[PDB]
């Protein structure tokens, strides 16, 4: 077969690019390793920036989101006996964040694409990339057991952290920066009504906790657990017990507990690759960078990469200005690093670290006391949380 | 002999307290270990906050300062090829910092006191503190070779980091927080005209540099050097060579070099003791805390401690409300920690650290790119640099 742009990975980064492109006339083919329902099984992301929200509207898939998504004007941070709120609306120039599950986002983009008649080959195993540096690159894969050859102009590797794309670039060409945090995130999704109309982040001597939501009758809770901990040791009972222990008395007494729909441990990591392209392969999403969930940026950065890529590809296809694709990584990384600095910061001021002396602990507490009490300090968090502008 | 308040250490913290108190009627005696000219030999501090400036005016010693001190509306930070200025005036609500040497400050307070006829016993060796917890505490010392006994109501330990005061409190009662940075500051005072009307802080791959001034015809320059480095290995020649290497081309070509008047290595450290008192002994200045010079806070924190102490002592002597001295450490530490968090921050974003991976370096650069480009981020530095409000 043949096409214009070939997309690797049918996750949010890929389907968002496939949709944007289809809607602009630029044909594309999406290849996925797993089954639609497995892709749909990932709970993952819940907090979206405004830039992403508008982007979904330009992709024409926002009906459901605008009906079920909860718009949030501010968040909360709890530490040392007191709960402190951040009014994101006034402090950010009028911006806000939308709460709407990644599972939903994917479900929506997936229906959108199914309707469009655009190509989507799931269960596409043994994906290999070829001739990235030549005028004609190609992607070969196995369907059941036959080798098929897809011919394209540009390959867009949106296949996640563990994808084949980043592996397909010569190791010497890529410089990697990575930081692994000595803790994990035990996520728990319940079909209970959330404990607060807004999110609560809590720093406690036992560790980090977070109180999220998916809707009015569905909640998402996290606690900080060591990397040697296995999900099976964590029953529903003990999770609730632990969470309650890590939150404010007034917040724990309101909490409505209940059976888990999903439970799992997300290991934290920071990762950035430089650059983000090789010949005709451009990486987008987790295929290029990972940020600790603390900041709610992964999906939101994937959107900015994708936005830049669609925009640059349009300029190259219709406007015949293919030279512009060279400044991809330059544009993206700019936003990526700033996001990463906030994600690392959020993570370092809310999590308890192993083997921390008395001085750093005092600095952490003060980091919170200052940034949550200074009007200039609240702002820095506010504008970073709603998200910095796409360049 | 006998008195009301006895002050240990005739440095800026002590003479500022002795002056404030004398001017309010509360008699005090100052004991110093060294000679006036040795105390006068310390180059140390050069940047003063507005709170301190007004405090000197209330102490009546500000004629000279208001004539020779240079008022600064903004500073500069240089990193990665570009120089970035921070307009402290607009960004801080209209505040600014004054450039005036500590040697001068001390010279001024010393003349002030000499004129006042108030007691000052230099070369007071073998100082020992007694009965801190009783109604009557006392301080004994040797003058030439005779043991003298000074009787007082309250002892004010303003004797610096290595003073006898902090040593005189039961170790179990004090909790210490300390951080030693793996680098030092090679200071150089020249009688040459400064390279910029405002201060330049520079982060460079060789290390930190800083371009200060004492007046229009006197400059103070610093470079970052390892702790194993001795001042004698650092000749004038090589210092200038090194400095030039660490600064912007456009700034290095304007630089007027010249012979050193003073040269020495200041080792960086962070130190806070909790609490700051014991019975009738209250610590103030470096006797209670040390902050890395990067932020220009040591002297300025000593002033806030002193201000609080004078104020509380007045309330106790004339107003007969001695119960109020119990909230000393509570009030002080509040400001102290916030200052320390900024001092540590300044130090971590401008200095090159040994054994830093690729990720932290990228985070440092981004820390600078964000805070120096965000209007909310510039503000956080601005208000912290001019100094937070005395409570
Ligand atoms: C617990 C958790 C919470 C989070 N919360 C937030 C939040 O609130 N807000 C936020 O903004 N971010 C958050 N994030 C991040 C966000 O989930 C991810 O950034 C996002 O899933 C990445 O989108 P992507 O399309 O690049 O990657 P992916 O979601 O990784 O999907 C990539 C697809 O590629 C497929 N694939 C892999 N290899 C191949 C191959 N060889 N060929 C073909 N297909 C392949 C995979 O099966 C997968 O389907 C969170 C992450 C976690 C773990
Ligand atoms: C290179 C450098 C640059 C700096 N720059 C700045 C700046 O720009 N701005 C700023 O705000 N801060 C700065 N600081 C800090 C500032 O210099 C100090 O915080 C300040 O000197 C402390 O005042 P003090 O009165 O507590 O201590 P001290 O200056 O330490 O004086 C204490 C006195 O106690 C005496 N003494 C000691 N033991 C005894 C004893 N047993 N009995 C009697 N006397 C005793 C000592 O001889 C000394 O005279 C800088 C510091 C350094 C090292």
UniProtKB/Swiss-Prot annotation, chains A, B:
It comes from Pseudomonas fluorescens. Pathway: Aromatic compound metabolism; benzoate degradation via hydroxylation; 3,4-dihydroxybenzoate from benzoate: step 2/2. Homodimer. GO terms for biological process: benzoate catabolic process via hydroxylation. Binds 1 FAD per subunit. Coiled coil: none annotated. Belongs to the aromatic-ring hydroxylase family. Changing residue 34 to T: Slight decrease of affinity for p-OHB and NADPH. Changing residue 161 to A: Decrease of affinity for NADPH. Catalyzes the incorporation of an atom of dioxygen into p-hydroxybenzoate (p-OHB) to form 3,4-dihydroxybenzoate (3,4DOHB). The reaction occurs in two parts: reduction of the flavin adenine dinucleotide (FAD) in the enzyme by reduced nicotinamide adenine dinucleotide phosphate (NADPH) in response to binding p-hydroxybenzoate to the enzyme and oxidation of reduced FAD with oxygen to form a hydroperoxide, which then oxygenates p-hydroxybenzoate. Pfam families: FAD_binding_3. Its EC number is 1.14.13.2. Changing residue 222 to A: Results in the removal of a large side chain involving in the binding of the carboxyl group of the substrate. This is p-hydroxybenzoate hydroxylase. Changing residue 269 to N: No significant changes in affinity for p-OHB are observed. However, the affinity for NADPH decreases strongly. Changing residue 44 to K: Decrease of affinity for the flavin prosthetic group. It affects NADPH binding, resulting in a low yield of the charge-transfer species between reduced flavin and NADP. InterPro entries: FAD-bd, FAD/NAD-bd_sf, HB_mOase, RIFMO-like. The keyword Oxidoreductase applies.
